[PDB]
């Protein structure tokens, strides 16, 4: 992918998450579990829906071929009609195939951006309160319960609340 | 103690202009630029100082053949373009046909 | 001690539908959608209930 | 049927068809393509 999230630093997808395109997997003292994110999912579904409605609706003016008949002494116009009809069909076939090929590339990269943006959204929230594992996971330098996990998912994580607890853990690890 | 700060931001004007994208519609942007004209004055005007030949109720055939109802166009000046009604009332006062009439009108587009 | 973790990931399933891009061919995606029709019944039916004139 | 072609009718449920250019009725737009698939999900992990 262009943004390096899908099949990138997140090596594989999650078969366990079936209710959303993007989401989180947490692991704390109270257990683990998959959970989908609402913000990226809502934006993506509407974004992809609008892309489909743009490719599929901006073709109502496509060339509709009309059957015309010519006699044996009108071969020039009949050949003119044949080449005129084939040309328009070729133009729209090229237009249809190329639009799909390009928008397919953009759609895959659009999903790649959403994953990377969601990861950076979590990253800039925790800051140095957790450790960047480099595999798509953040290892908290403090206890993070189920309420703490959900606060990260909806852009409300309070950095100063756990900053002092994380500072003690960081100094313990650095000292050896 | 809270130290010095620097921030990165972007422009935010007071324009209600909107555009469209593939994945999103009606997106308000700081600067846009229309490239489509949608207004006309509803008149027929001279083409760079040259008055058009407006046939009014007469047709091209009646003008050329000299229909007595077309005395306005006995000696027309130089024109830029010809304006003809879809079905002028004064076309052939005596009924008949004008042979290769469409071919003559094609030639008249270059005169 | 291994601390608590939160991970960011994307959907995956058992779909076999494939798409093509400009730079890459035969890419498997979770969700795809055909937009082309390739079947016909081989008959000459009525057009919206009106029977055609078959000479 | 709602769309008829010289080779047969088509269920007019998709934007495009590749059966025959000469169509009458509520017909999809004709293309010479053999396949037209829009990716809507993300890159599936094997």
């Amino acid at each position, epitope marked *: 992918g262009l943004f390096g999230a899908i099949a990138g630093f997140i090596e594989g997808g999650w078969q366990g998450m079936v*209710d959303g395109w993007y989401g989180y997997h947490h692991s704390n003292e109270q257990g683990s579990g998959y959970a989908a994110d*609402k913000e990226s999912t*809502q934006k993506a*579904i*509407d*974004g*992809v*829906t*609008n892309k*489909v*409605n743009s490719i*599929i*609706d901006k073709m*109502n003016t496509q060339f509709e071929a009309v059957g015309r008949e010519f006699n044996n002494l009108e071969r020039r116009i009949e050949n003119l009609n044949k080449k005129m009809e084939d040309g328009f069909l070729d133009v729209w076939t090229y237009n249809a195939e190329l639009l799909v090929l390009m928008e397919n590339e953009r759609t895959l990269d659009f999903h790649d951006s959403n994953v990377k943006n969601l990861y950076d959204k979590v990253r800039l929230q925790l800051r140095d309160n957790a450790k960047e594992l480099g595999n798509g996971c953040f290892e908290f330098y403090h206890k993070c319960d189920n309420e703490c996990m959900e606060s990260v998912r*909806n852009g409300t994580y309070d950095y100063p609340q756990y900053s002092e607890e994380a500072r003690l853990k960081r100094e313990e690890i650095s000292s050896g | 103690d809270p130290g010095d700060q620097i921030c990165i931001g972007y422009h935010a004007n007071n324009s209600t202009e909107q555009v469209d994208t593939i*994945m*999103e*519609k*009606n997106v308000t942007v700081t600067h846009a630029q229309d490239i489509l004209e949608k207004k006309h004055n509803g008149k027929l005007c001279d083409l760079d100082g040259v008055k058009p030949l407006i046939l009014r109720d007469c047709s091209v055939a009646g003008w050329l053949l000299g229909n007595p109802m077309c005395d306005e166009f006995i000696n027309v000046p130089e024109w830029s373009y010809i304006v003809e009604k879809a079905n002028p009332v004064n076309d052939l006062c005596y009924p008949g046909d004008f042979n290769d009439y469409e071919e003559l009108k094609h030639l008249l587009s270059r005169i | 001690d291994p601390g608590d973790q939160i991970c960011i990931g994307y959907h995956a399933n058992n779909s076999t539908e494939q798409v093509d891009t400009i730079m890459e061919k035969n890419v498997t995606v979770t*969700h795809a*959608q055909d*937009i082309l029709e390739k079947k016909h019944n081989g008959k000459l039916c009525d057009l919206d209930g009106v029977k055609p004139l078959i000479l | 049927t709602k769309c008829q072609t010289p080779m047969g009718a088509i*269920n*007019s*449920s*998709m*934007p495009f068809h590749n059966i025959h250019p000469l169509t009458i009725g*509520e017909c999809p737009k004709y293309v010479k393509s053999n396949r037209l698939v829009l990716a*809507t999900g993300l890159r599936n992990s094997p």
Partner: antibody
Amino acid sequence: VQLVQSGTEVKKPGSSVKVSCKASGVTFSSYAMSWVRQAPGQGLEWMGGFIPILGTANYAQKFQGRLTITADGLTGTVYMELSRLRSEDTAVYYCAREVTWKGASIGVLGIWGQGTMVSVSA
Amino acid sequence: DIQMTQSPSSLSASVGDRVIITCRANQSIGGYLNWYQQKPGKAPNLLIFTASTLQSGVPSRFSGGGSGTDFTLTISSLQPEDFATYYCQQNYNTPRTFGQGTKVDIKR
């Protein structure tokens, strides 16, 4: 665009009702639809939805197993099928397009139909 | 599920008054709320989506705001066209939930 539904149905108990939701014009659309019922003089009730780009239909708990929301491909037409009808199913059934002036909007019902009234008695 | 409760259930006002309708929830829905207006014998018409943004054609007198669990729909100058039932709908959870319904009534 406008959304048009079927006519008023007078069904017998235990039968099935299929209500269509077509759009006006030959245009093809992949907008997500939603079916909402409203009992006579009561409030609105979400029955289910259908997201064409996902190919899935979402249903409600009180309708699961009795409701079938399908679509005629990409023609902008969606269908609902309520089975095992009872007198308590008597209501006005609406179909709404999930769209705003911003384009597709998966949650908000911008364009509505006219409603199809369903009556159930022996 | 996410139960949505409206307050008040049926208010009374006259032309020119400021009408405030509050819609609650039993779970935080993060700004994913919509407002609808139903006139007698007519399909519901959308007024506000995403709890703040007005749908096209809605007069500026209609206003909305809120975040989390408490929401508000406000009509600055009530005109003899806003007398109807108002519903609040969530677009956060898959089992979509509607409000009970608040009916603004003519005062006399």
